[PDB]
Amino acid sequence: VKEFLAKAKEDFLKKWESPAQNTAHLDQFERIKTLGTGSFGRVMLVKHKETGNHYAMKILDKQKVVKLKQIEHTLNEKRILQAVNFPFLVKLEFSFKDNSNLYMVMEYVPGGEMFSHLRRIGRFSEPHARFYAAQIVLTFEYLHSLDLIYRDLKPENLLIDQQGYIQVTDFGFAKRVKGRTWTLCGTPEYLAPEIILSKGYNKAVDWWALGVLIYEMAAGYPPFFADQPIQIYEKIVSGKVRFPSHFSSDLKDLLRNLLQVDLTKRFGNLKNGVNDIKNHKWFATTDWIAIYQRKVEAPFIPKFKGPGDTSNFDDYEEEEIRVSINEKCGKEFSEF
Numbered sequence: 263v264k265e266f267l268a269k270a271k272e273d274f275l276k277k278w279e280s281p282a283q284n285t286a287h288l289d290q291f292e293r294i295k296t297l298g299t300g301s302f303g304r305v306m307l308v309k310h311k312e313t314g315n316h317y318a319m320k321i322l323d324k325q326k327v328v329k330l331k332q333i334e335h336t337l338n339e340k341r342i343l344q345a346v347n348f349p350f351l352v353k354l355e356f357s358f359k360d361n362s363n364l365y366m367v368m369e370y371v372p373g374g375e376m377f378s379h380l381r382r383i384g385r386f387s388e389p390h391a392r393f394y395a396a397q398i399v400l401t402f403e404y405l406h407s408l409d410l411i412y413r414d415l416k417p418e419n420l421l422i423d424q425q426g427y428i429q430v431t432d433f434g435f436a437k438r439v440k441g442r443t444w445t446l447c448g449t450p451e452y453l454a455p456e457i458i459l460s461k462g463y464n465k466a467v468d469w470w471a472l473g474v475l476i477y478e479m480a481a482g483y484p485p486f487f488a489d490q491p492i493q494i495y496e497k498i499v500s501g502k503v504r505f506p507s508h509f510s511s512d513l514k515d516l517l518r519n520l521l522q523v524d525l526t527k528r529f530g531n532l533k534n535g536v537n538d539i540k541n542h543k544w545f546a547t548t549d550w551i552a553i554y555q556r557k558v559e560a561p562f563i564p565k566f567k568g569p570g571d572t573s574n575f576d577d578y579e580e581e582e583i584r585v586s587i588n589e590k591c592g593k594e595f596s597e598f
């Protein structure tokens with residue numbers, strides 16, 4: 263099998279070492295509508311004037327990026343996204359920059375974020391949750407083979423595409439790492455114990471986070487929650503879970519082995535690696551190759567009423583895209 267994961271790595275390393283740069287420019291796109299906003303930027307649905315194709319364009323303001331010390335994160339996201347290639351990872355088509363802003367143009371993923379679907383319809387059934395988890399399992403297998411740690415899994419970062427499959431976005435926090443690392447990033451509810459305990463950690467944190475995600479999909483809320491963020495940390499390093507009574511025996515077994523506080527016993531981090539997860543009884547009815555090739559009917563297909571449609575995202579006040587007459591922060595974004 264692993265003649266796959268070897269060429270995938272050669273390809274990754276070639277792109278990683280010499281990143282694509284300046285592959286389009288602003289006036290090649292018509293701006294239609296705001297899909298999202300953030301502390302340093304917004305995301306807009308745009309149309310390519312020539313091909314008529316729809317895309318999602320992330321527009322980051324260089325000054326705000328510097329203000330909030332996000333230089334390294336921003337650079338890192340673009341570098342990773344232009345280097346990876348996998349069915350469940352969003353596709354970066356173009357990137358470029360101007361006097362004012364950085365630009366990332368990604369294939370438009372129209373079904374919106376898993377977070378809003380989960381909150382719209384309440385907990386998913388086990389089969390529905392399992393379909394999603396399987397995709398994350400394969401995605402982590404891939405990222406891990408490249409020594410990338412994702413460390414940002416949460417419902418809000420999974421978009422649903424037209425066929426009901428997952429596309430992962432957000433790679434700002436992802437780090438290439440063989441060995442340990444220390445930065446404390448990620449939503450509090452998803453953090454593994456070893457991150458909090460500050461003695462270093464590795465890719466095993468992704469498998470913990472997968473456990474949180476499966477719990478949230480199946481239950482409707484995360485296993486470890488509280489008003490005070492200090493109080494969340496204690497719940498995590500303790501690791502006591504209350505499983506709802508509707509959870510099947512297989513699911514509880516899998517989660518006891520993913521929400522394992524000791525990384526050295528956690529599933530996905532042992533001698534058999536990811537296979538301990540794939541061969542778990544909860545995944546017995548899953549056909550791993552069929553999921554990979556997208557030849558499994560999705561349990562849910564988003565309302566998809568025509569190509570430029572944005573009704574799966576929220577509505578935002580539109581503001582102007584201003585380009586200064588003068589270059590800002592050229593030195594810091596030269597590698598972008």
Ligand SMILES: COc1cc2c(Cl)nccc2cc1C(=O)N[C@@H](c1ccc(C#N)c(Cl)c1)[C@H]1C[C@H](O)CN1
Nearest residue numbers: 297298299300301302303304305318368370371418
């Ligand atoms: C609405 O947000 C998106 C929509 C996309 C569509 Cl429709 N298709 C393809 C790629 C897309 C990427 C994003 C995105 O990168 N969003 C990220 C993002 C990151 C930073 C900023 C800033 N500043 C913004 Cl506006 C969005 C955040 C937003 C959520 O927390 C989850 N990830």
